[PDB]
């Protein structure tokens, strides 16, 4: 997964799943990588992508 | 009988009676409130970008 460059369409500070990040990634093997929240503040719906 | 106020209607008024209307009556600020529903508001990631 590399020049992995996200934009943040939503983002509102609600109860559910608030964060829409849209991550342009280039994947060099097709396959499911796993999505880690690096900030303990944020919570990441999906876990694989 | 003289001019009346379908030729004498200041502010540029529409006056009709029977019922007595002044339709196009050119003036006020018209308070609108649309409560509209929540539907239409597709985001960004419904949006095209």
Do not use: W
């Not at chain 1, 939503?10 to 900030?39: E, L, N, P």
């Not at chain 2, 009988?1 to 009556?25: D, E, K, W, Y």
């Amino acid at each position: 997964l590399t020049d992995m460059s996200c934009e943040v369409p939503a983002c509102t500070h609600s109860s559910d799943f608030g964060g829409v990040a849209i991550i342009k990634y280039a994947a060099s093997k097709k396959g499911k990588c796993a999505v880690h929240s690096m900030t303990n503040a944020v919570t990441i719906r999906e876990a694989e992508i | 009988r003289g001019a009346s106020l379908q030729h004498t209607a200041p502010f540029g008024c529409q006056i009709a009676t029977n019922p007595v209307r002044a339709m196009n009556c050119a003036v006020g600020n018209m308070p609108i409130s649309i409560d509209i529903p929540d539907a239409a508001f597709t985001r960004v990631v419904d949006a095209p970008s």
